[PDB]
Amino acid sequence: NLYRSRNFYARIRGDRALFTNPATSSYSVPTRQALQGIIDGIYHKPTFTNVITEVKVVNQIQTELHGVRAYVSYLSDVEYLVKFHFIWNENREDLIQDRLPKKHEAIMERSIRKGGRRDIFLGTRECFGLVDEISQEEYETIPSYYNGVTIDLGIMFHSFAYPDTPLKSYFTKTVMENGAIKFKPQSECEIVNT
Ligand SMILES: [Cl-]
Ligand SMILES: [Cl-]
């Protein structure tokens, strides 16, 4: 098959988060867009594309209100386990000389381990996230509050089209099975808006 990095696993924690529908209060769980932003914050170069395949929602979904009434609903006390990998960016063949698997996998590993190359945000400039590396064994065994049930989380924003033409948004039916949410390719999203 085409080049694919090893699977990487990251744990993301935050006291507060705000995951929104930018093509319209927080969704109850991260969107693919939000997770993409988190993982890219750990390490990204246009040579490669980070591909988020699954997230585990570890803690009970809780929100809290902030604002005035004559309004902002944030998630509270969140923990996500993210499974992802990278592939070479087909849209940047001009960077083909930098497609060095050992180099990028080493940097990714180091980057997750140190908590990311950049500050990690969970939806606002005040919602900081904390990233650390977990093993596949840990990804598989850390208990989720939602283990035992499967829950329809409804239609959620997936991502914007990429990469002139009007901006298209993709949305997806979102099911959380024993705390785990898988992310389908943009091309499989049932709902598209321009
Ligand atoms: Cl390839
Ligand atoms: Cl869908």
Short mmCIF file of N, CA and C and ligand atoms in Angstrom, two decimals:
data_model
loop_
_atom_site.label_atom_id
_atom_site.label_comp_id
_atom_site.label_asym_id
_atom_site.label_seq_id
_atom_site.Cartn_x
_atom_site.Cartn_y
_atom_site.Cartn_z
N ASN A 1 0.82 -1.20 0.00
CA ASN A 1 0.00 0.00 0.00
C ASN A 1 0.86 1.26 0.00
N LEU A 2 0.20 2.41 -0.07
CA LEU A 2 0.90 3.68 0.01
C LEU A 2 1.53 3.79 1.39
N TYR A 3 2.57 4.60 1.51
CA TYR A 3 3.21 4.80 2.80
C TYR A 3 2.20 5.23 3.86
N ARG A 4 2.35 4.67 5.06
CA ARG A 4 1.54 5.04 6.20
C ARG A 4 2.48 4.90 7.39
N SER A 5 2.49 5.89 8.27
CA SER A 5 3.27 5.78 9.49
C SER A 5 2.66 4.72 10.42
N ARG A 6 3.42 4.38 11.45
CA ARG A 6 2.85 3.56 12.51
C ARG A 6 1.68 4.30 13.16
N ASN A 7 0.81 3.54 13.83
CA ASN A 7 -0.25 4.20 14.57
C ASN A 7 0.41 4.89 15.76
N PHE A 8 -0.03 6.10 16.05
CA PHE A 8 0.40 6.83 17.22
C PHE A 8 -0.78 6.98 18.15
N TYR A 9 -0.49 7.07 19.44
CA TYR A 9 -1.54 7.23 20.44
C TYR A 9 -1.21 8.37 21.39
N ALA A 10 -2.16 9.28 21.54
CA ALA A 10 -2.00 10.44 22.40
C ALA A 10 -3.16 10.56 23.37
N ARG A 11 -2.85 10.95 24.59
CA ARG A 11 -3.87 11.32 25.56
C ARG A 11 -3.93 12.85 25.69
N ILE A 12 -5.14 13.40 25.56
CA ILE A 12 -5.36 14.85 25.64
C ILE A 12 -6.27 15.13 26.81
N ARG A 13 -5.85 16.02 27.70
CA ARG A 13 -6.66 16.39 28.86
C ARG A 13 -6.87 17.90 28.91
N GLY A 14 -8.01 18.33 29.43
CA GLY A 14 -8.26 19.75 29.57
C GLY A 14 -9.32 20.03 30.60
N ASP A 15 -9.19 21.15 31.31
CA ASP A 15 -10.20 21.51 32.29
C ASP A 15 -11.47 22.00 31.60
N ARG A 16 -11.31 22.49 30.38
CA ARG A 16 -12.39 23.12 29.65
C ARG A 16 -12.17 22.97 28.16
N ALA A 17 -13.26 22.82 27.41
CA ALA A 17 -13.15 22.74 25.96
C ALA A 17 -14.39 23.33 25.30
N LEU A 18 -14.24 23.75 24.05
CA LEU A 18 -15.34 24.31 23.28
C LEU A 18 -15.20 23.85 21.84
N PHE A 19 -16.01 22.87 21.46
CA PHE A 19 -15.95 22.30 20.11
C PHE A 19 -17.21 22.76 19.40
N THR A 20 -17.04 23.46 18.28
CA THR A 20 -18.18 24.12 17.68
C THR A 20 -18.47 23.69 16.26
N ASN A 21 -19.66 24.06 15.81
CA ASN A 21 -20.04 23.97 14.42
C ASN A 21 -19.72 25.32 13.77
N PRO A 22 -18.63 25.36 12.99
CA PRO A 22 -18.19 26.60 12.36
C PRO A 22 -18.96 26.90 11.08
N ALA A 23 -19.83 25.98 10.67
CA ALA A 23 -20.64 26.17 9.47
C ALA A 23 -22.10 26.38 9.84
N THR A 24 -22.34 26.91 11.03
CA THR A 24 -23.69 27.06 11.55
C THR A 24 -24.46 28.15 10.81
N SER A 25 -22.14 27.29 21.72
CA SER A 25 -22.27 26.13 22.61
C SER A 25 -21.57 24.89 22.06
N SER A 26 -20.80 24.25 22.93
CA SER A 26 -19.97 23.13 22.52
C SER A 26 -20.80 21.90 22.14
N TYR A 27 -20.39 21.22 21.07
CA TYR A 27 -20.76 19.83 20.85
C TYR A 27 -20.32 19.07 22.10
N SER A 28 -20.85 17.87 22.30
CA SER A 28 -20.53 17.09 23.49
C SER A 28 -19.18 16.37 23.44
N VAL A 29 -18.60 16.25 22.23
CA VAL A 29 -17.34 15.56 21.98
C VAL A 29 -16.61 16.30 20.87
N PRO A 30 -15.30 16.03 20.68
CA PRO A 30 -14.57 16.74 19.62
C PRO A 30 -15.06 16.35 18.23
N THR A 31 -15.00 17.31 17.32
CA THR A 31 -15.20 17.04 15.92
C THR A 31 -13.88 16.55 15.30
N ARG A 32 -13.95 16.01 14.08
CA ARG A 32 -12.70 15.67 13.42
C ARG A 32 -11.86 16.93 13.26
N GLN A 33 -12.50 18.04 12.89
CA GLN A 33 -11.78 19.32 12.74
C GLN A 33 -10.97 19.64 14.00
N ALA A 34 -11.61 19.54 15.16
CA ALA A 34 -10.94 19.87 16.41
C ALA A 34 -9.76 18.96 16.69
N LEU A 35 -9.96 17.66 16.47
CA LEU A 35 -8.90 16.68 16.69
C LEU A 35 -7.73 16.91 15.74
N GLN A 36 -8.06 17.22 14.49
CA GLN A 36 -7.04 17.56 13.50
C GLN A 36 -6.18 18.71 14.01
N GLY A 37 -6.82 19.71 14.61
CA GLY A 37 -6.12 20.90 15.07
C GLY A 37 -5.22 20.52 16.22
N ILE A 38 -5.70 19.63 17.08
CA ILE A 38 -4.88 19.17 18.20
C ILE A 38 -3.65 18.39 17.75
N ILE A 39 -3.86 17.41 16.87
CA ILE A 39 -2.76 16.58 16.40
C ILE A 39 -1.76 17.39 15.59
N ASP A 40 -2.26 18.27 14.73
CA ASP A 40 -1.35 19.13 13.96
C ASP A 40 -0.53 20.02 14.91
N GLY A 41 -1.12 20.38 16.04
CA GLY A 41 -0.40 21.18 17.03
C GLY A 41 0.75 20.41 17.68
N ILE A 42 0.62 19.09 17.74
CA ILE A 42 1.68 18.25 18.27
C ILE A 42 2.86 18.29 17.31
N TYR A 43 2.58 18.08 16.02
CA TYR A 43 3.61 18.14 14.97
C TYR A 43 2.96 18.08 13.60
N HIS A 44 3.29 19.03 12.74
CA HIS A 44 2.85 18.95 11.36
C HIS A 44 3.84 19.64 10.44
N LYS A 45 4.01 19.06 9.26
CA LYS A 45 4.76 19.68 8.16
C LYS A 45 3.93 19.36 6.93
N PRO A 46 3.90 20.26 5.95
CA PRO A 46 3.05 20.01 4.77
C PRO A 46 3.52 18.81 3.94
N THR A 47 4.69 18.28 4.27
CA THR A 47 5.19 17.07 3.60
C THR A 47 4.19 15.93 3.81
N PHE A 48 3.58 15.91 4.99
CA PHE A 48 2.68 14.82 5.37
C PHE A 48 1.33 15.32 5.85
N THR A 49 0.38 14.40 5.94
CA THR A 49 -0.96 14.69 6.38
C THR A 49 -1.29 13.78 7.56
N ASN A 50 -1.65 14.38 8.68
CA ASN A 50 -2.09 13.62 9.84
C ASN A 50 -3.51 13.13 9.60
N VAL A 51 -3.74 11.87 9.91
CA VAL A 51 -5.03 11.23 9.67
C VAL A 51 -5.51 10.66 10.99
N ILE A 52 -6.56 11.28 11.54
CA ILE A 52 -7.12 10.84 12.81
C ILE A 52 -8.14 9.77 12.50
N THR A 53 -7.95 8.58 13.06
CA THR A 53 -8.87 7.48 12.77
C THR A 53 -9.89 7.15 13.87
N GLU A 54 -9.54 7.39 15.13
CA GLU A 54 -10.46 7.06 16.24
C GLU A 54 -10.15 7.92 17.47
N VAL A 55 -11.19 8.24 18.24
CA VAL A 55 -10.98 8.90 19.52
C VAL A 55 -11.79 8.16 20.59
N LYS A 56 -11.23 8.05 21.78
CA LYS A 56 -11.99 7.50 22.91
C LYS A 56 -12.28 8.63 23.89
N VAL A 57 -13.56 8.76 24.26
CA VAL A 57 -14.02 9.76 25.21
C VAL A 57 -13.99 9.09 26.58
N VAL A 58 -13.06 9.51 27.43
CA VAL A 58 -12.83 8.79 28.68
C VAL A 58 -13.78 9.18 29.80
N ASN A 59 -14.05 10.47 29.90
CA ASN A 59 -14.86 11.01 30.99
C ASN A 59 -16.30 11.28 30.62
N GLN A 60 -17.18 11.19 31.62
CA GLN A 60 -18.57 11.59 31.47
C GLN A 60 -18.62 12.99 30.87
N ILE A 61 -19.47 13.17 29.86
CA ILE A 61 -19.69 14.46 29.24
C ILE A 61 -20.37 15.38 30.25
N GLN A 62 -19.74 16.52 30.53
CA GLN A 62 -20.29 17.52 31.42
C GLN A 62 -20.10 18.86 30.75
N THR A 63 -21.05 19.76 30.93
CA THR A 63 -20.86 21.11 30.42
C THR A 63 -21.11 22.10 31.53
N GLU A 64 -20.73 23.35 31.29
CA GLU A 64 -20.99 24.39 32.25
C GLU A 64 -21.21 25.68 31.47
N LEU A 65 -22.13 26.50 31.96
CA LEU A 65 -22.50 27.73 31.27
C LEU A 65 -21.64 28.89 31.71
N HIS A 66 -21.43 29.83 30.79
CA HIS A 66 -20.77 31.09 31.09
C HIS A 66 -21.33 32.16 30.17
N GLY A 67 -21.70 33.30 30.73
CA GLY A 67 -22.27 34.37 29.95
C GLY A 67 -23.27 35.18 30.75
N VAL A 68 -24.14 35.90 30.04
CA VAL A 68 -25.12 36.77 30.68
C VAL A 68 -26.54 36.46 30.23
N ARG A 69 -27.51 36.89 31.04
CA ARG A 69 -28.93 36.65 30.76
C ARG A 69 -29.80 37.79 31.27
N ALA A 70 -30.60 38.37 30.37
CA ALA A 70 -31.44 39.51 30.72
C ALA A 70 -32.85 39.08 31.12
N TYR A 71 -23.78 34.05 26.62
CA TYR A 71 -24.00 32.61 26.76
C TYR A 71 -22.92 31.79 26.06
N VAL A 72 -22.17 31.00 26.84
CA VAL A 72 -21.24 30.03 26.28
C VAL A 72 -21.25 28.76 27.13
N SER A 73 -21.61 27.64 26.51
CA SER A 73 -21.59 26.35 27.19
C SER A 73 -20.30 25.60 26.84
N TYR A 74 -19.44 25.39 27.84
CA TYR A 74 -18.17 24.71 27.63
C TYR A 74 -18.24 23.27 28.13
N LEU A 75 -17.48 22.38 27.51
CA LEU A 75 -17.23 21.08 28.13
C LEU A 75 -16.29 21.28 29.32
N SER A 76 -16.41 20.39 30.30
CA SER A 76 -15.62 20.47 31.51
C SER A 76 -14.94 19.13 31.79
N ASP A 77 -13.69 19.20 32.25
CA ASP A 77 -12.94 18.02 32.69
C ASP A 77 -12.93 16.89 31.66
N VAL A 78 -12.31 17.17 30.51
CA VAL A 78 -12.29 16.23 29.40
C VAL A 78 -10.98 15.46 29.31
N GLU A 79 -11.08 14.24 28.80
CA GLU A 79 -9.93 13.41 28.49
C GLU A 79 -10.25 12.60 27.25
N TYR A 80 -9.39 12.71 26.24
CA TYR A 80 -9.57 11.97 24.99
C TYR A 80 -8.31 11.17 24.71
N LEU A 81 -8.51 9.96 24.22
CA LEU A 81 -7.41 9.15 23.70
C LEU A 81 -7.56 9.14 22.19
N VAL A 82 -6.50 9.52 21.48
CA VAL A 82 -6.58 9.66 20.04
C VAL A 82 -5.64 8.69 19.33
N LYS A 83 -6.17 8.01 18.32
CA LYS A 83 -5.38 7.12 17.48
C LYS A 83 -5.25 7.76 16.10
N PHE A 84 -4.02 7.90 15.63
CA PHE A 84 -3.79 8.58 14.37
C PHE A 84 -2.51 8.09 13.72
N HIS A 85 -2.33 8.46 12.46
CA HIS A 85 -1.12 8.12 11.73
C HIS A 85 -0.93 9.23 10.73
N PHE A 86 0.19 9.20 10.01
CA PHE A 86 0.34 10.14 8.91
C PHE A 86 0.67 9.43 7.60
N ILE A 87 0.38 10.13 6.51
CA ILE A 87 0.66 9.65 5.17
C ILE A 87 1.32 10.83 4.44
N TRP A 88 1.92 10.57 3.29
CA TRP A 88 2.51 11.66 2.52
C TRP A 88 1.40 12.48 1.88
N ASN A 89 1.60 13.80 1.82
CA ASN A 89 0.60 14.71 1.29
C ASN A 89 0.64 14.70 -0.24
N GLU A 90 -0.34 14.05 -0.86
CA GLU A 90 -0.38 13.94 -2.32
C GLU A 90 -0.42 15.30 -2.99
N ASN A 91 -0.92 16.30 -2.28
CA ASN A 91 -1.03 17.66 -2.81
C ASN A 91 0.27 18.45 -2.73
N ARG A 92 1.27 17.89 -2.06
CA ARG A 92 2.59 18.51 -2.03
C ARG A 92 3.69 17.61 -2.60
N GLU A 93 3.59 17.26 -3.88
CA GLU A 93 4.64 16.47 -4.50
C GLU A 93 5.94 17.25 -4.61
N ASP A 94 5.86 18.58 -4.51
CA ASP A 94 7.07 19.40 -4.54
C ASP A 94 7.94 19.18 -3.30
N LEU A 95 7.38 18.52 -2.29
CA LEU A 95 8.08 18.19 -1.05
C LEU A 95 8.50 16.72 -1.00
N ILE A 96 8.53 16.08 -2.17
CA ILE A 96 8.80 14.64 -2.23
C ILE A 96 10.16 14.29 -1.62
N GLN A 97 11.11 15.22 -1.74
CA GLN A 97 12.46 15.02 -1.19
C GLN A 97 12.47 14.93 0.34
N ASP A 98 11.40 15.38 0.99
CA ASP A 98 11.32 15.34 2.45
C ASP A 98 10.51 14.14 2.96
N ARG A 99 10.14 13.23 2.06
CA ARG A 99 9.35 12.06 2.47
C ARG A 99 10.28 11.00 3.05
N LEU A 100 10.71 11.26 4.28
CA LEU A 100 11.70 10.45 4.97
C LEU A 100 11.02 9.83 6.19
N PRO A 101 10.52 8.59 6.05
CA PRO A 101 9.72 7.95 7.10
C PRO A 101 10.40 7.98 8.48
N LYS A 102 11.64 7.49 8.56
CA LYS A 102 12.34 7.45 9.84
C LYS A 102 12.42 8.82 10.51
N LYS A 103 12.75 9.85 9.72
CA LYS A 103 12.85 11.22 10.23
C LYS A 103 11.55 11.70 10.87
N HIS A 104 10.45 11.59 10.13
CA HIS A 104 9.19 12.13 10.60
C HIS A 104 8.56 11.31 11.72
N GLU A 105 8.70 9.99 11.66
CA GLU A 105 8.16 9.15 12.72
C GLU A 105 8.88 9.42 14.04
N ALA A 106 10.19 9.63 13.97
CA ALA A 106 10.98 9.92 15.17
C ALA A 106 10.55 11.26 15.77
N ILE A 107 10.41 12.27 14.93
CA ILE A 107 9.98 13.58 15.39
C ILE A 107 8.56 13.54 15.97
N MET A 108 7.67 12.78 15.34
CA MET A 108 6.30 12.66 15.84
C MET A 108 6.31 12.05 17.23
N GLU A 109 7.04 10.95 17.35
CA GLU A 109 7.14 10.24 18.62
C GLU A 109 7.65 11.18 19.70
N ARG A 110 8.75 11.87 19.40
CA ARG A 110 9.34 12.83 20.33
C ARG A 110 8.36 13.96 20.65
N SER A 111 7.62 14.40 19.64
CA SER A 111 6.68 15.51 19.81
C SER A 111 5.49 15.19 20.72
N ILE A 112 4.91 14.00 20.56
CA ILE A 112 3.85 13.58 21.46
C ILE A 112 4.41 13.45 22.87
N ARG A 113 5.59 12.85 22.97
CA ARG A 113 6.21 12.59 24.27
C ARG A 113 6.44 13.87 25.08
N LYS A 114 6.84 14.94 24.41
CA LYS A 114 7.14 16.18 25.12
C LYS A 114 5.93 17.09 25.30
N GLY A 115 4.78 16.64 24.83
CA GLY A 115 3.55 17.38 25.02
C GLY A 115 3.21 18.28 23.84
N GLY A 116 3.91 18.09 22.73
CA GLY A 116 3.61 18.85 21.53
C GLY A 116 4.59 19.97 21.25
N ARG A 117 4.82 20.22 19.97
CA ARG A 117 5.73 21.28 19.55
C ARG A 117 5.15 22.67 19.74
N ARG A 118 3.83 22.76 19.73
CA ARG A 118 3.12 24.03 19.93
C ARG A 118 2.17 23.90 21.11
N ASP A 119 1.70 25.03 21.61
CA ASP A 119 0.61 25.00 22.58
C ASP A 119 -0.60 24.35 21.95
N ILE A 120 -1.28 23.52 22.74
CA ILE A 120 -2.46 22.81 22.29
C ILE A 120 -3.71 23.48 22.86
N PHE A 121 -4.64 23.82 21.98
CA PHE A 121 -5.87 24.49 22.40
C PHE A 121 -7.09 23.62 22.18
N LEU A 122 -8.07 23.77 23.06
CA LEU A 122 -9.30 22.99 22.95
C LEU A 122 -10.48 23.91 22.67
N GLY A 123 -10.32 24.84 21.74
CA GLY A 123 -11.46 25.59 21.24
C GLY A 123 -11.48 27.09 21.46
N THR A 124 -10.71 27.57 22.44
CA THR A 124 -10.47 28.99 22.60
C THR A 124 -9.03 29.19 23.04
N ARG A 125 -8.57 30.43 23.02
CA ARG A 125 -7.19 30.72 23.38
C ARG A 125 -6.97 30.56 24.89
N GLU A 126 -8.06 30.31 25.62
CA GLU A 126 -7.98 30.13 27.07
C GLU A 126 -8.18 28.67 27.48
N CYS A 127 -8.57 27.83 26.53
CA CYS A 127 -8.76 26.41 26.79
C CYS A 127 -7.51 25.62 26.42
N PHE A 128 -6.54 25.55 27.33
CA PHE A 128 -5.32 24.81 27.02
C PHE A 128 -5.52 23.31 27.21
N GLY A 129 -4.86 22.53 26.36
CA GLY A 129 -4.88 21.09 26.48
C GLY A 129 -3.51 20.58 26.88
N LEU A 130 -3.49 19.42 27.52
CA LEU A 130 -2.26 18.78 27.92
C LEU A 130 -2.18 17.45 27.18
N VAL A 131 -1.09 17.26 26.44
CA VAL A 131 -0.90 16.06 25.64
C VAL A 131 0.20 15.21 26.23
N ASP A 132 -0.03 13.91 26.32
CA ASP A 132 1.06 12.99 26.61
C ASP A 132 0.92 11.70 25.78
N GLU A 133 2.01 10.95 25.64
CA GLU A 133 1.96 9.75 24.82
C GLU A 133 1.47 8.57 25.64
N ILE A 134 0.63 7.75 25.03
CA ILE A 134 0.24 6.48 25.63
C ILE A 134 0.59 5.35 24.67
N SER A 135 0.65 4.13 25.21
CA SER A 135 0.94 2.95 24.40
C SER A 135 -0.36 2.43 23.79
N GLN A 136 -0.24 1.57 22.78
CA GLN A 136 -1.41 0.94 22.20
C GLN A 136 -2.16 0.16 23.28
N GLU A 137 -1.40 -0.48 24.16
CA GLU A 137 -1.97 -1.25 25.27
C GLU A 137 -2.81 -0.34 26.15
N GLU A 138 -2.27 0.84 26.46
CA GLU A 138 -3.02 1.82 27.24
C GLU A 138 -4.24 2.33 26.50
N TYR A 139 -4.07 2.68 25.23
CA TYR A 139 -5.20 3.11 24.42
C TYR A 139 -6.35 2.10 24.49
N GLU A 140 -6.00 0.82 24.48
CA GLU A 140 -7.00 -0.26 24.49
C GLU A 140 -7.59 -0.56 25.88
N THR A 141 -6.87 -0.22 26.95
CA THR A 141 -7.28 -0.65 28.29
C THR A 141 -7.80 0.45 29.23
N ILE A 142 -7.41 1.70 29.01
CA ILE A 142 -7.90 2.79 29.85
C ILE A 142 -9.44 2.81 29.83
N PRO A 143 -10.06 2.72 31.01
CA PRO A 143 -11.52 2.58 31.07
C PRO A 143 -12.24 3.86 30.67
N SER A 144 -13.26 3.73 29.83
CA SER A 144 -14.15 4.84 29.52
C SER A 144 -15.48 4.77 30.29
N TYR A 145 -15.94 5.93 30.74
CA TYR A 145 -17.25 6.07 31.37
C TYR A 145 -18.36 5.54 30.45
N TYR A 146 -18.11 5.56 29.15
CA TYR A 146 -19.13 5.15 28.16
C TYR A 146 -18.97 3.71 27.67
N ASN A 147 -18.04 2.98 28.26
CA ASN A 147 -17.94 1.56 27.96
C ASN A 147 -19.26 0.90 28.38
N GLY A 148 -19.83 0.07 27.50
CA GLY A 148 -21.06 -0.65 27.83
C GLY A 148 -22.26 -0.17 27.03
N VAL A 149 -22.18 1.06 26.53
CA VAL A 149 -23.28 1.61 25.74
C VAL A 149 -22.83 2.15 24.39
N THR A 150 -23.78 2.20 23.46
CA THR A 150 -23.55 2.84 22.18
C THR A 150 -24.56 3.97 22.04
N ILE A 151 -24.06 5.15 21.67
CA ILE A 151 -24.84 6.38 21.74
C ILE A 151 -24.79 7.14 20.43
N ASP A 152 -25.96 7.52 19.93
CA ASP A 152 -26.03 8.41 18.76
C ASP A 152 -25.83 9.85 19.21
N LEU A 153 -24.73 10.46 18.76
CA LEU A 153 -24.43 11.84 19.14
C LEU A 153 -24.97 12.85 18.13
N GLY A 154 -25.66 12.34 17.12
CA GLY A 154 -26.30 13.19 16.13
C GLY A 154 -25.34 13.65 15.06
N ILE A 155 -25.85 14.47 14.14
CA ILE A 155 -25.03 15.01 13.07
C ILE A 155 -24.03 16.03 13.62
N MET A 156 -22.77 15.89 13.24
CA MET A 156 -21.74 16.81 13.69
C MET A 156 -20.88 17.28 12.52
N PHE A 157 -20.43 18.52 12.59
CA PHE A 157 -19.43 19.01 11.65
C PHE A 157 -18.23 18.07 11.59
N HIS A 158 -17.78 17.79 10.38
CA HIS A 158 -16.61 16.95 10.13
C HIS A 158 -15.40 17.82 9.76
N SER A 159 -15.51 18.54 8.65
CA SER A 159 -14.38 19.34 8.17
C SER A 159 -14.79 20.15 6.95
N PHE A 160 -13.93 21.11 6.57
CA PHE A 160 -14.16 21.90 5.37
C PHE A 160 -13.44 21.24 4.20
N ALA A 161 -13.93 21.47 2.98
CA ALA A 161 -13.27 20.97 1.79
C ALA A 161 -11.84 21.52 1.66
N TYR A 162 -10.94 20.71 1.13
CA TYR A 162 -9.54 21.11 0.95
C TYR A 162 -8.82 20.20 -0.04
N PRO A 163 -8.03 20.78 -0.96
CA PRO A 163 -7.86 22.21 -1.22
C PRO A 163 -8.44 22.60 -2.57
N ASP A 164 -10.68 29.27 -7.98
CA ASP A 164 -11.16 29.15 -6.61
C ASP A 164 -12.65 28.84 -6.58
N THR A 165 -13.13 28.33 -5.45
CA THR A 165 -14.50 27.85 -5.34
C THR A 165 -15.05 28.13 -3.93
N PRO A 166 -16.39 28.12 -3.77
CA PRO A 166 -16.98 28.38 -2.45
C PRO A 166 -16.61 27.31 -1.42
N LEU A 167 -16.45 27.73 -0.17
CA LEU A 167 -16.06 26.82 0.90
C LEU A 167 -17.18 25.80 1.16
N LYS A 168 -16.85 24.50 1.10
CA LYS A 168 -17.83 23.45 1.40
C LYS A 168 -17.58 22.87 2.77
N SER A 169 -18.67 22.56 3.48
CA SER A 169 -18.57 21.95 4.78
C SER A 169 -19.13 20.53 4.72
N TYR A 170 -18.49 19.63 5.45
CA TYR A 170 -18.93 18.25 5.53
C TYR A 170 -19.42 17.96 6.93
N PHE A 171 -20.50 17.18 7.03
CA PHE A 171 -21.04 16.77 8.33
C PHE A 171 -21.28 15.28 8.33
N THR A 172 -21.26 14.68 9.52
CA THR A 172 -21.34 13.23 9.62
C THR A 172 -22.23 12.79 10.77
N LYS A 173 -22.99 11.72 10.55
CA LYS A 173 -23.64 11.02 11.65
C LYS A 173 -22.54 10.58 12.59
N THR A 174 -22.74 10.78 13.88
CA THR A 174 -21.69 10.48 14.86
C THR A 174 -22.18 9.47 15.88
N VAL A 175 -21.56 8.30 15.92
CA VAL A 175 -21.96 7.25 16.87
C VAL A 175 -20.76 6.95 17.78
N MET A 176 -21.01 6.92 19.08
CA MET A 176 -19.97 6.61 20.04
C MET A 176 -20.28 5.23 20.62
N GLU A 177 -19.42 4.27 20.30
CA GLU A 177 -19.59 2.88 20.66
C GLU A 177 -18.59 2.51 21.75
N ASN A 178 -19.11 2.26 22.94
CA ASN A 178 -18.28 1.99 24.12
C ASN A 178 -17.23 3.07 24.34
N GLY A 179 -17.63 4.30 24.08
CA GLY A 179 -16.78 5.47 24.25
C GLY A 179 -15.92 5.83 23.05
N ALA A 180 -15.93 4.99 22.02
CA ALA A 180 -15.07 5.20 20.86
C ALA A 180 -15.83 5.77 19.67
N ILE A 181 -15.24 6.78 19.03
CA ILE A 181 -15.80 7.35 17.82
C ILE A 181 -14.78 7.19 16.70
N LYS A 182 -15.21 6.59 15.59
CA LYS A 182 -14.38 6.46 14.41
C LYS A 182 -14.70 7.59 13.45
N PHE A 183 -13.72 8.00 12.66
CA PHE A 183 -13.93 9.09 11.72
C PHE A 183 -13.79 8.61 10.30
N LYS A 184 -14.85 8.81 9.52
CA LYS A 184 -14.88 8.38 8.13
C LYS A 184 -14.22 9.42 7.24
N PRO A 185 -13.78 9.01 6.05
CA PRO A 185 -13.20 9.96 5.10
C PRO A 185 -14.22 11.02 4.75
N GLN A 186 -13.73 12.20 4.39
CA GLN A 186 -14.59 13.30 4.01
C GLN A 186 -15.56 12.90 2.91
N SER A 187 -15.10 12.07 1.98
CA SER A 187 -15.91 11.63 0.85
C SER A 187 -17.08 10.72 1.22
N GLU A 188 -17.12 10.25 2.46
CA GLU A 188 -18.21 9.36 2.88
C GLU A 188 -19.27 10.10 3.71
N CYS A 189 -19.02 11.38 3.98
CA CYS A 189 -19.97 12.19 4.74
C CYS A 189 -21.28 12.40 3.98
N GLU A 190 -22.40 12.12 4.64
CA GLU A 190 -23.71 12.14 3.98
C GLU A 190 -24.23 13.55 3.76
N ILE A 191 -23.71 14.50 4.53
CA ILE A 191 -24.23 15.85 4.53
C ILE A 191 -23.13 16.82 4.07
N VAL A 192 -23.44 17.58 3.03
CA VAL A 192 -22.50 18.58 2.51
C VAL A 192 -23.25 19.88 2.28
N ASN A 193 -22.64 20.99 2.69
CA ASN A 193 -23.23 22.30 2.48
C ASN A 193 -22.20 23.25 1.90
N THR A 194 -22.66 24.18 1.07
CA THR A 194 -21.77 25.16 0.45
C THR A 194 -22.13 26.59 0.86
CL CL B 1 3.21 6.83 -0.70
CL CL B 2 -22.85 10.71 7.48
#
